[PDB]
Amino acid sequence: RTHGTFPMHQLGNVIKGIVDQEGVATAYTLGMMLSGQNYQLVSGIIRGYLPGQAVVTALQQRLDQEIDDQTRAETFIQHLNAVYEILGLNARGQSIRLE
Amino acid sequence: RTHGTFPMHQLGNVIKGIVDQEGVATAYTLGMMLSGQNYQLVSGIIRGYLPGQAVVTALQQRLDQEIDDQTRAETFIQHLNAVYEILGLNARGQSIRLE
């Protein structure tokens, strides 16, 4: 299951378009509102579109902490922004610092 | 012009899917981030997907006040939420009151 109302791809149309335009956390967010609270889908989709291994690591780190099963989702993007805090990304999934 | 990065319809795929799922102001918002700050496009697209004539009226009302040309866009969804304040809608483009 990927979509019912929003004309998503076979997985996450919203996600790609947004990762480039607004960044992963928005692509993530919109994947959440459009596809539903299907954390599995968004995390699977954006994980490949995540800035680098660090952003997914940080996000996974948040998931490792796992507040709950659904609460992962509830705070999934909050955790992605937390990611931005961890590694130094901005809202656009871009790095504001140089490594 | 409707889209370049995000696989939008011939006008606003994001917009329909979202109006049902998250509401016009989000559909509006996402149309703004994905399609660009093309207020013309989002206003034209969502106008048909706006809850009722009242929500579009209120939004148009905001546009009537027009802070600037681009600033309409800048605050377009803020104005849509303002719409929600005008007529009694919630964030989902739904009416929280009965007429």
Swiss-Prot record, chains A, B:
Superkingdom of source: Viruses
PTM comment, free text: Specific enzymatic cleavages in vivo by viral protease yield mature proteins. The protease is not cleaved off from Pol. Since cleavage efficiency is not optimal for all sites, intermediary molecules are expressed.
Cysteines engaged in disulfide bonds, as pairs: none
Role this protein plays: Involved in capsid formation and genome binding. Shortly after infection, interaction between incoming particle-associated Gag proteins and host dynein allows centrosomal targeting of the viral genome (associated to Gag), prior to nucleus translocation and integration into host genome.
Record comment regarding domains: Gag protein contains 3 glycine-arginine motifs (GR-boxes) necessary for RNA packaging, the first of which has nucleic acid binding properties in vitro.
Other facts noted in the record for this chain: Foamy viruses are distinct from other retroviruses in many respects. Their protease is active as an uncleaved Pro-Pol protein. Mature particles do not include the usual processed retroviral structural protein (MA, CA and NC), but instead contain two large Gag proteins. Their functional nucleic acid appears to be either RNA or dsDNA (up to 20% of extracellular particles), because they probably proceed either to an early (before integration) or late reverse transcription (after assembly). Foamy viruses have the ability to retrotranspose intracellularly with high efficiency.
Protein name: Gag polyprotein
Originating organism: Human spumaretrovirus (SFVcpz(hu))
Gene that this sequence comes from: gag
